[PDB]
């Protein structure tokens with residue numbers, strides 16, 4: 001069925017399925033639509049013989065240069081996507097709800113890539129975009145397929161961040177704290193302002209754009225302090241670096257960062273260490289440091305994140321496209 005957002009009871013049922021599913025994704029929670037307030041929300045789900053929700057998909061529709069809409073379910077749907085027959089059923093419900101307004105329904109679940117899975121998907125009619133498309137550009141996948149994920153379940157006895165790493169890394173993580181770096185966290189407006197100054201400063205230094213503060217304010221309004229948390233690193237009165245992490249389902253996700261110019265005393269490591277501590281304190285299975293464009297020492301993002309993730313990057317199946325309008329699809333989507 002399609003979710004009626006004007007019905008509190010139905011919304012709460014939908015939310016409880018999302019929050020409690022081991023496949024839950026924050027970008028699939030209904031709060032996400034509030035963040036992307038410029039997109040149109042359309043949500044659907046499936047029920048079992050008992051009438052209990054067993055699968056869900058939160059879509060967001062965006063405009064294009066054509067008369068068709070772009071339907072996107074960021075990191076969805078919420079279910080075991082390898083159970084393709086069930087996925088087909090969920091997608092059929094999604095397609096019905098789209099009522100022919102979109103040229104495609106794209107979803108990029110965080111499930112490992114494999115030739116076998118890629119083939120099954122293609123056999124069921126879906127168009128997949130992974131090892132077959134450009135690494136970057138506007139033809140590249142929206143989300144990175146390579147992500148540095150720290151699997152905390154490999155260290156059941158771990159009490160603090162340090163217990164997760166070799167001595168060489170313990171030293172790197174200790175350095176900022178030894179040099180006076182202190183980190184406080186929460187989800188207050190003051191902390192948001194703190195994050196925003198470092199976020200935009202970082203943006204300017206790199207000559208890149210940045211999202212407006214209202215984006216993060218909507219995020220702060222949508223998720224409580226047990227879901228959204230801002231970490232701020234300071235040294236003797238000076239603001240050094242910050243980071244935003246979201247806790248949902250089986251993982252804490254490092255989504256945004258900021259750092260002032262000049263001497264930052266390795267504050268970014270301190271921020272990471274505390275986000276990891278939060279994952280440990282809450283018994284979270286995974287700490288997702290985000291994507292990388294290449295597992296190479298020529299990539300500064302890979303370098304940094306490799307400090308905290310020694311395992312190889314997880315490679316996801318990529319974008320799964322249910323083509324609805326083939327002509328427009330070909331015009332707006334290429335490899």
Ligand SMILES: [Mg+2]
Pocket residue numbers: 063064065066067068
């Ligand atoms: Mg248009």
